Amino acid sequence: TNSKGYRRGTRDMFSRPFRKHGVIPLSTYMRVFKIGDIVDIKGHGAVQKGLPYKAYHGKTGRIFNVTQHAVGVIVNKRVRGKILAKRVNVRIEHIHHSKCREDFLRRVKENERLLKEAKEKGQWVSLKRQPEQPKKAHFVKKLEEPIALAPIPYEFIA
Amino acid sequence: GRRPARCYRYCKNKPYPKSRFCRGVPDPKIRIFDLGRKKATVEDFPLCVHLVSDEYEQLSSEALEAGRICCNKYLVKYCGKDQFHIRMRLHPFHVIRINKMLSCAGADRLQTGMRGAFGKPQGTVARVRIGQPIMSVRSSDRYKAQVIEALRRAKFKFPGRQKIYVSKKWGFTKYERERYEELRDDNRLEPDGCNVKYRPEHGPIAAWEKAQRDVYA
Amino acid sequence: MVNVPKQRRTFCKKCKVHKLHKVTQYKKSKERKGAQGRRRYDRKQQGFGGQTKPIFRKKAKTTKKIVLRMECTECKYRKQTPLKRCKHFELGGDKKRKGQMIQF
Amino acid sequence: KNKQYFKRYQVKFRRRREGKTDYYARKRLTFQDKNKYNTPKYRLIVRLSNKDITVQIAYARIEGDRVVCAAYSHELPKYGIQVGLTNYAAAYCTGLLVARRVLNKLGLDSLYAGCTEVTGEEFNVEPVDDGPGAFRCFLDVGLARTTTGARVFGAMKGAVDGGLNIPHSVKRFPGYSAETKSFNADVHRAHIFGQHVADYMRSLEEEDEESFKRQFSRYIKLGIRADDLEDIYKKAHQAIRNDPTHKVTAKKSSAVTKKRWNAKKLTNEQRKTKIAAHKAAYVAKLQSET
Amino acid sequence: AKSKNHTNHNQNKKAHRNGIKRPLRKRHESTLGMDVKFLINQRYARKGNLSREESVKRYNERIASQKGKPKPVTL
Amino acid sequence: VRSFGIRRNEKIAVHCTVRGAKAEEILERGLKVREYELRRENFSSTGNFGFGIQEHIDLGIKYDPSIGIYGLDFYVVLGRPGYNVNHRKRKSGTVGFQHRLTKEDAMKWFQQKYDGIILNT
RNA sequence: CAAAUAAUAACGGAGGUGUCCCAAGGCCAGCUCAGUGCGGACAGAAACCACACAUAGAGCAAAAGGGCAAAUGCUGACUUGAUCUCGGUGUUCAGUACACACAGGGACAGCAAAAGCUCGGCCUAUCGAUCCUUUUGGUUUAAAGAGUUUUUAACAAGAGGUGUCAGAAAAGUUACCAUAGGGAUAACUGGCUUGUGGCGGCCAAGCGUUCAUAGCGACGUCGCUUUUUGAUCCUUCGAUGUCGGCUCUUCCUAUCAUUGUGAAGCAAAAUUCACCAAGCGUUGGAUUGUUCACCCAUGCAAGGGAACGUGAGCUGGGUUUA
RNA sequence: AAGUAAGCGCGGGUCAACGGCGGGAGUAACUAUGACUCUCUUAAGGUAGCCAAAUGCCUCGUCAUCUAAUUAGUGACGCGC
RNA sequence: CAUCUAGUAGCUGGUUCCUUCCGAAGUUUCCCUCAGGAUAGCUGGUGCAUAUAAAUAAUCUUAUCUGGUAAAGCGAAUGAUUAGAGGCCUUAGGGUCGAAACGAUCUUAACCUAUUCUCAAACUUUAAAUGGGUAAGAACCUUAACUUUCUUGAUAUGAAGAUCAAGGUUAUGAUAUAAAUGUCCCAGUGGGCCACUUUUGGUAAGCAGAACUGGCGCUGUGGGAUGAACCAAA
RNA sequence: GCCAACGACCAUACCACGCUGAAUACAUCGGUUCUCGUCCGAUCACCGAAAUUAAGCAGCGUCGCGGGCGGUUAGUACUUAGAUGGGGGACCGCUUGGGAACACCGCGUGUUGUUGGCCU
C-alpha cells in the first residue's frame, strides 16, 4: 500500500537510455516555444529541477505560457472518470515538439497547392483522405518459370 | 522436515533466488552436476544422448540427485569405468519456502496460525520446459545400447515424462556429425576439452597463418 | 552542535536594504495575568467544577524549532525566522576546520 | 581494454574529446530566455594562439554558430604593425578592429564613435538618445585562464573602445593591483601602446646585449626600435578607425577539385583482392618449407 | 470482521455512464498564472489600438515618408 | 595504519621537485655518491628511473648535528620535447608510441651521460 | 509486488524517517575518482614520492533508486538567496487543508571578467489545525461621554502540539454480574482442506551363505486416506444439550480368527506372504472420569472403524456458574 | 522581594506491619559424592521443620508396601515447576 | 413504589392502495472512524438553451509521441553458478630428476586469456501483443502594415494583439440511442459475491488478497436431471 | 583536394597500432624584465622567434576491437479475440488478427553549418 510519493515507480521512467548519459546536447535550450504549440512530455532524469510528476510523462499538451526557463503546458489527465485539463509548469529540457500535426500541416500545404492547379481541370480535386480500399482486379502473369513450386506441410521430426 | 514434492503440483510464482535479498539461504547438500571422464577430449566421445522433458514439470533437487547416481552406477558397471561424461543440465536455483508453525507445548498462540505469513526456505527445484534437456551423457558409439538403459533407469526417478533422444550431434558440440567431420578435415575446428572452436574469418589475420604454419608444419 | 554565526548580513525591511544583523535566541517570555485566555482560564476553575479544561499528556516530539531573532545594527529592528528541528544548537562557537589531523 | 567496456563505452561529445569547448560554459554563454523567443545574443569570441589572435562575433543557432564579424591579427601589417602579432598591445587593435568592422556595416559608426582618447580608464558607453543603446557582445574566453592582464581581456577593451556594449569590470585589466583595487589606468595605458614590450627591449641593451639576437629578433631585421612602439600603435588606432573592410578576397573560383588529390580509400573489391594474394603467396612461402 | 477493502470493481461501468467526458473546447482560455509582464501593458498593446484602419493606413505612408525602416533593423 | 602510527592527515613526509639544469646539480651530486654505476631496476617501464641514498651529508653538506642525518629518495622523471602535449588545458592530446621512451632508452641515456654501467642484478 | 501510462490489496517481501548541516548552503576557478601496472634507501601485504592506464567500477549527511566527470565528486576564493514579498501551479486530492516541490512577478543582495537566473541541502522522506500562550510588527486601530499615560484588546508574521501524526484530557477487575445485538465473531456438530500420521503401486542400490524380488527393500517417484490433527469461518448466538461409560441396533473392510485356496529359504509341527471372502465371533478384571497404550487372566484364536451413533435413554465421574 | 505552618525531602525506630528469604566453578587412592577453597553479588539469601502433600509442571517420579494384576492408598526418599 | 420519562439506542423488529415510467450502490477521501457518518461517485425529478451544417460528441483507419511486461539475454554490465581447454606466470601448496637447482618433466593450485552448462520479485544491450496520449481546418491557411510603457530587441521586422486583403468541393471511416447546461448536492448506497485471464500469500481450501472485463445481487424464461453465477436469451 | 576559429548531431566520430603529409595554419619550441601564478616559468600568465616526422584534424592502412546499418533468425517466440476444443492434471492443438530478440553473416567507418585562408 503505496504509490505516495513523488518519484516512486520512476526507476525506469526517469532513467537515462543506454549510453545516452552525461552532458545534455546544446540544441535542447535552442528550441523556440510559442504560445499554443503542441508539445510532448518525456522527462529528463539528469535535470532534477522542473521535472513533471509521473502522470504526465508520455502525455501531450499545448503550450499556454512561456517564461524564462519553462513552458506552462496544458495537459489532459483522466481523473476517473472525467478529464480535467491540467496546467503543468515544466522546464524546457523535459519538453519536446510534437511531430503529430506537422504532417497534417503538410497536407493543408497540399490542399491548397492541388486546389490551385485545379482551377484548370476542375475535378476531382480529391481533398479527402481515403482508407485502404480493396485492391483491384489485376492480371498476375506468371512467366516466372511455371508453377509448382508447390509447398506441402512438413516440419516436425527431432 | 523434508516433506516430498508429492503435493506441490500447482507451482505458480516468480523465482525467488538465493541472493542479497533473502540472505539465510543454506549451503546445498546437492552440489556436483557432472561426472565420469570429464577430462576427456572432444574426439574421445562422439555420441551424445539426452534425456529430454516433454512436459512442464518442476523437477526436484533430490529427484535430480537420485537420477544421476542411478545413471552413474549402471554405466560404471556395464560399459566401462571411464567411458562416459554425464552432464546434469538442470542447476536448481529456486526457493520453495515453508511456513513452519512451531506449535510445541500447545499453548503459545503468538507466532502464526493464518496471520501472518513470512516463510522459511526449504526447497530447491528446477523448472523444465518442453524439449529442454535434463541430462546428457557423452560416450562412444560402441556403448550406444548401454547408454540408453542408464537413462531409462533414471527415468523412473523423475516426475513427468521424458524422452530419450540419441542426438545426431558429434558430442556436446553443436555440430552435425557430418559437419563436424568436414570442418575438422581442413583446419577450422581447433579443439578444447568439451567443445571445439569454430570457423574463424575474423580477426585480424595473425591467426590465419598460425593455422597455415600448423597445417603444413 | 549545529553552528550559527552571531552576525548575519541580510535584508532588513525598515531600511529596505541589506544591513548587518546580530543573531540571538528567543526562549519564551512567560505568560501574564491578565492575558485574556488566562483571565478566562482562571474564572472557569474558580472552585467546585473540578478541571474544566484539557491537560495535555502524550507528547511526542523531542526537539523544537529555534526562533533566531536578528536585530539590525542601524535601525535597531528585530526580525525572526525559524530554523528546522535539531537537537543541539549553538550561537557562534568555533567554525569547523578543513582537513586537519584527526584528533583521537 | 578488451571488448566489454567498449560495448558500454559512451564517448564525450567531439570537442570535449579534443579540448575545444567547455559545454558547461557553452551552455551558459549561449543561454537565451524562452520569452525572448528567437533573439540572437552575439557573444564576443577572442581565441589566442601562438601567432594569431582570432576575434569573432557569433550567435547561437542550431545547425551551427553563425559568425557575423571576424578580425584576425594576420592583417595588422596593413595598419602599420609588422611584428609582435600576439601582444597585449596587438590585441587592442584586433579588439578595436572587430568593433569598427561591424559598426560600419550595421551603420552604427556615425553614432557610437568610441574612445580614440585611449587612456586605460573604465569606459562604458552611454546610449545615444533617440532610441536604445548599441550592439552588445558578451566576452567568450573558452578556458583561457582569466587572470588579470591576459591578452583575452586585451580584446574586450579594444572592442569596447570601438563602442560595443560589453559588460565590464576592470579587475582583469593589466595594471589593476590586488591590494586593493586600486584602479590605475596608466599601466593599462602602458600596455595598450606597447610600453612594457618597449621597456624590456630598452632594458636588454643594459644586461645582455647579445640577447637582441635572441628575443626581439626580427625587430633587428625590420628595423623597429623601442621608442617607435608608442607611436607605431598610436598611429594604427586611426588607420584602423578609417578602413574596416573585412578583407574579402576573390580567387574565382579555386576551392573544389584542387586538382589532383581526391585521396580514395581502398574500394572493397581491392581489399578482397589485397587478401587474395596475401593469402595465396603466404602458403606458397609455406611451400618453400618443403 | 475485517471484511473486504479496496476494489476497482464496477468503477469504470460507474464512470462511463455519464460519460468519460472531454472538458470542452474554448476560443477564450484564461490568462491567469501566465507571465504577468507579458500581459500587463499588452493590456495596453490593445488599448493603443484607438483606431486600426482609418488613421493606420495613413501610417503606411507616414513612415514611408522616411522610406520605412528597411535597412537598419538587420542587427 | 596503527602499525606505523600514522593516521589521516598526520604530515609524515617532506618532498620537493627540481626541474631543469638545477637537477643536474643534485642529480650528479647524488649520483657519484651512488658512484654513477647504478642498479638495473631502478628503471621503470615508463622511462623514469630513480634511486635512493642514505647519508644526506654526501651532497656537499657539512654534517651539522643540529639537524641530524637523513636518508632520501631521488626520482628522475625523464622526457622528450612535446611531453607537455597532455599537460596543456586547451586542446589536449596524447603522446603516441614513438615518441614515448622505454626503459631501454633511459638506460641508453645513462650509459652515455655520466657513463654509468647498468649492473645486472 | 503490479500484469510495458498513471492507479492498485494482504499482519505480502526488503529496508528507511522523527534527524544532521556556518558548510554538508550559495557561486566561480583549479582539479580527477575506484582500482591496476612498472618504479623509488630505511619501507615490508599495505606509509610516502612520482610516471602510465583507467566509463565513473569512486564520491556525493542520503535508506533504496535515479542522476552526475574541465560536475552535483576533491580542493581553494569570497560569501549568507537558509532573505523580503505577492499570487499561481504540481503532488496527495473531495481536485479540501497542511506540508513538500515548482514556475513566475516586485524588490534588495552573493559569487563571477562576464554570461549566468542562487528563493537552503543533486532529486524522491525528514512533520502538524481551532482555542490558548508568546514574540516580532506597524511607528498602528478600538475600550462606544472626552482627553492624557499605563494596562488590555485587535490585526500581520512566527514559535510553544497534538507520533492514535485532519489533532478527546483518561487505569484495572467481575466466576456476583446486567442490557442491546451478532452466526458481520470464537467454543462443539456438519462442509471443504490436509501440511502430520499411516495404506497401497512403479524403478531396483542392496540385504537374504549362495540368490535383486521366498521374505525384504535405500535414494527417488506417483496416488489413496481426515478420522486424530491443524487450517478455515459457510450454516446455527429470539440456543441443534457440550467428554466418557452403561444400554441397544445396524453398517464398512483397510481380514485377527475360522471356510475354500495359491506361495515359501513349506519334511512334520509351528509360522510367514498373498487371494476369494464381512457369515459367526472378537471376553472377565486391578489402577485411572478418561479416550489409546500398559498389567493379571482366560482363551483354537483375543482385527481395525462408521451414524462427533445414542442425556425428553440413564448416569453425572471429567469438564464448567455461584 | 524577604521571612514563612503543616506536609514532603533528609534522619531514626519498627516485620505475631505489608512482604521477601541468590548464583558459578574447582577439588577426597575404582568411580561416584563434595565436609573443604575461591568468587560474584543481597535488605536478608528459606533456618527449625516438612514434602511428589487438598501444595511437584515434568509424572502414572524412584524404592518399598498393599493386589493375581493398583495412573489409587500408605511408608519413605528429596537441587522442592 | 411513583415521578423526572414517550430518558437514550451508530442496534434488532415492524412500517398499511393499484398501475405506469426511469433505475442504483457495496467505491474515494476523511473521522476514537471499522454494525456508523460526512464526502465524491452512481440515481431520479425538474427544467432551460439549441422541431411545417463546416453543431459537435464517441469505438476503428492514418500521423505522431509514450511504455520495459511477455519473449529475449548472460560468448554485454551487475548477481549468480558448472565443467574442462590454452597459457602470461614467478603467486607457488610444496614439488618432480636434483641439497634448492633454472640441469629437465613443470606436478598441481593460484593468476590471465579464447570457450562452456544453467539462471534471476527487488538484474538487463534488445524488446512485442494488448495499452496510454495527441492530431486529423473558418476556432483554418498563407499575406499586407498597425499597436505595445509591460514586451523584447538599439527593430515602436520580434512576440502577442487589433484590422483590412486572397483562398472551388470543410479535408479518414462509420454513428447520431437528440445531444448541451443548470438546479434539488435529490433518494438509496458506502457487508458484496461468482467466473475466464493475470496474480500474491498459503501444504491446501466451497480459504485470504488484488488487476481486467463480463455476470448474480436487482431477473423471469429455454438448456445443464438437480442448482445465484454456466450455455442460450433478457 | 585542404587549413583554422566557432559549432550542430554526439563512436559510421571511439580504441589499438602502422605509414604518409604540398601550402596556409596549427604546434611543439625560446625567455622570464613586465602582468600573473606555482614547492618548482612543467602547468597557468606574459614577452616571441632560433629546429621538425609527436599532437592535430586527418590522408590513410588493418580478412583490427567497438559502434552503425541491412539481411537472416522467423511468420519463430510471445500475444489479441473464439469455442459445450483436447487432456486426469500440467499444459497442448486449431480459429482470428498482430508480431519480436540475442546471436549469426554481410556492409560501410563521421556527416555537415557559418566565417576567414591555402592550393600540392
Sign of CA dihedral A103, A107, A108, A113: positive
Residue B124 beta carbon within 7 A of nucleic strand G: no
Q: What angle do CA C4, C6, C12 make, to 5 degrees?
A: 100
Partner-chain contact C99 F10, CB within 8 Å:
no
Look-up of cell digits 474564572: C43
Residue A105 to residue A37: CA distance in whole angstroms = 13
The three-state secondary structure class of A65 is strand
The three-state secondary structure class of A106 is helix
What is the CA D146 to C1' G54 distance in angstroms? 31
What is the CA D218 to C1' J3 distance in angstroms? 26
Decide the pairing of beta strands C2-4 and C89-91: parallel
CA nearest neighbour of F30 among F1, F50, F3, F15: F50
Q: Which residues contact D34 (CB under 8 A, 6 or more apart)?
A: A32, A33, A66, A67, A68, A69, A70, A71, A92
Residue B150 to residue B179: CA distance in whole angstroms = 28
Residue in D275, D286, D287, D289 to test binding to B, most B beta-carbons within 10 Å: D286
Other CB atoms within 10 A of residue A54 CB: 16
CA nearest neighbour of B177 among B163, B196, B150: B196
Q: Which three cell numbers stand for residue C71?
A: 536585530
D227-230: long-range contacts, CB 8 A cutoff, minimum separation 24: D227/D198, D227/D202, D229/D89, D229/D193, D229/D194, D229/D195, D229/D197, D229/D198, D230/D193, D230/D194, D230/D195, D230/D198
User: Do the beta carbons of residue D97 and residue D71 sit within 8 Å?
Assistant: yes
B96-99: long-range contacts, CB 8 A cutoff, minimum separation 24: B96/B8, B96/B121, B96/B122, B96/B123, B96/B124, B96/B125, B97/B16, B97/B121, B97/B122, B97/B123, B98/B122, B98/B123
Indicate which technique resolved this structure. Answer: cryo-EM
User: Do the beta carbons of residue B72 and residue B86 sit within 8 Å?
Assistant: yes
Residue type at position F12? I
Q: Which residues contact B70 (CB under 8 A, 6 or more apart)?
A: B150, B153, B154, B157
The answer, yes or no, to whether D and F have at least 3 beta-carbon pairs within 8 Å is yes
Residue B118 beta carbon within 7 A of nucleic strand I: yes
Look-up of cell digits 590465419: B208
Give residues 82 to 101 of C whose Cβ lies within 8 Å of F: 99-101
- Please, what's the largest Cα pairwise distance for chain D? 99
Look-up of cell digits 576573390: D250
Q: Which three cell numbers stand for residue D243?
A: 578602413
Which backbone phi and psi does D79 adopt, to 5 degrees? Answer: -120, 10
Residue A40 to residue A102: CA distance in whole angstroms = 14
CA nearest neighbour of B37 among B139, B124, B110, B151: B139
CB hemisphere CA count around F80 (13 angstroms): 15
Chain D hits for F89, CB-CB cut-off 8 Å, are 19, 143, 145
Look-up of cell digits 455519464: E18
Partner-chain contact E72 D35, CB within 8 Å:
no
Partner-chain contact A32 D9, CB within 8 Å:
no
Residue E74 to residue B109: CA distance in whole angstroms = 89
| Kind and range of the H or E run holding A83 | strand A83-91
**Order of strands, edge to edge, in the sheet holding C78-86?**
C7-12, C17-23, C64-72, C78-86
CA B87 to chain centroid = 5
Chain D hits for A31, CB-CB cut-off 8 Å, are 62
Other CB atoms within 10 A of residue B120 CB: 9
CA nearest neighbour of F82 among F93, F72, F73: F93
| Kind and range of the H or E run holding C84 | strand C78-86
What is chain D's alpha carbon radius of gyration, rounded to the nearest angstrom? 26
How does DSSP assign chain D, residue by residue? -TTTSSTT-----SSTTTT---SSSHHHHS---SSSTT----EEEEEE-SS-EEEEEEE--TT--EEEEEE-STTGGGGT--S-TTSSHHHHHHHHHHHHHHHTTTT-SSS-----S---S---PPPPSSS----B--EE-TT----TT-GGGGTHHHHHHHT-B----GGGSTT--SSS----HHHHHHHHTTHHHHHHHTSHHHH-GGGGSSSS-SHHHHT--GGGHHHHHHHHHHHSSS---TT-----S-SSS-SS-------HHHHHHHHHHHHHHHHHHTTS--
Residue C92 beta carbon within 7 A of nucleic strand G: no
Q: What is the 3-state secondary structure (H, E, C) of D15-72?
A: CCCCCCCCCCCHHHHCCCCCCCCCCCCCEEEEEECCCCEEEEEEECCCCCCEEEEEEC
Residue A91 to residue A70: CA distance in whole angstroms = 4
Chain D hits for A19, CB-CB cut-off 8 Å, are 8-10
Between the two ends of chain E, the Cα-to-Cα distance in Å is 79
Q: Which three cell numbers stand for residue D221?
A: 631585421
Treating both helix axes as pointing N-terminal to C-terminal, what angle do D229-239 and D89-103 enclose, rounded to 10 degrees? 10
Q: Which three cell numbers stand for residue A129?
A: 483522405
The answer, yes or no, to whether D and E have at least 3 beta-carbon pairs within 8 Å is yes
User: What's F83's DSSP letter?
Assistant: G
Residue D86 beta carbon within 7 A of nucleic strand J: yes
User: Do the beta carbons of residue D115 and residue D123 sit within 8 Å?
Assistant: yes
Give residues 23 to 52 of E whose Cβ lies within 8 Å of D: 35, 38
Resolution given for this structure, in angstroms: 3.0
User: Do the beta carbons of residue B195 and residue B138 sit within 8 Å?
Assistant: no
Q: Which three cell numbers stand for residue A45?
A: 532524469
| Kind and range of the H or E run holding A77 | strand A70-78
User: What's F108's DSSP letter?
Assistant: H
Q: What is the 3-state secondary structure (H, E, C) of F24-71?
A: HHHHHHCCCCCCCCCCCCCECCCCCEEECCCCHHHCCCCCCCCCCCCC
CA dihedral A15, A19, A23, A26 (to 10 degrees): -100
Q: What is the 3-state secondary structure (H, E, C) of chain B?
A: CCCCHHHCCCCCCCCCCCCCCCCCCCCCCCCCCEEECCCCCCCCCCEEEEEEECCCCEEEHHHHHHHHHHHHHHHHHHCCCCCEEEEECCCCCCCEECCCCCCCCCCCCCCCCCCCCCCCEEECEEECCCCEEEEEEEECCCCHHHHHHHHHHHHCCCCCCEEEEECCECCCCCCEHHHHHHHCCCCCCEECCCCEECCCCCCCCHHHHHHHCCCCC
Residue D138 to residue D41: CA distance in whole angstroms = 8
Q: How many residues does this entry show for chain C?
A: 104
What is chain A's alpha carbon radius of gyration, rounded to the nearest angstrom? 26
D8 touches chain A (CB under 8 A): yes
* CB within 7 A of strand J (chain D, 213-232): 214-219
